[PDB]
Design a protein around this nucleic acid. Structure first.
Length: 62
DNA sequence: CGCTAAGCGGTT
DNA sequence: AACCGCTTAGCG
């Protein structure tokens, strides 16, 4: 039953996440931890964004 | 509605 | 542990 609050990413955060995705389709644990730290996000928020972004990427190229 | 963050069951 | 492939649900 108990759900996490949906994260609202700042324009800055979305911009940097998208920049990271265009450089690298996947992150090492350490690059993920560095990006989360740089954008004041949690490791898991950045991991979930990567994964949602990969799904999107497969739809829009397929 | 459309986009997408988070949840679920199963893959590797 | 992280990913996949899909689903659920929040909000503009």
């Amino acid at each position: 039953k108990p759900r996490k609050a949906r994260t609202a990413f700042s324009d800055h955060q979305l911009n940097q996440l998208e920049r990271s995705f265009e450089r690298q389709k996947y992150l090492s644990v350490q690059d993920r931890m560095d990006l989360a730290a740089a954008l004041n996000l949690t490791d898991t928020q950045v991991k979930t964004w990567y994964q949602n972004r990969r799904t999107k990427w497969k739809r829009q190229t397929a």
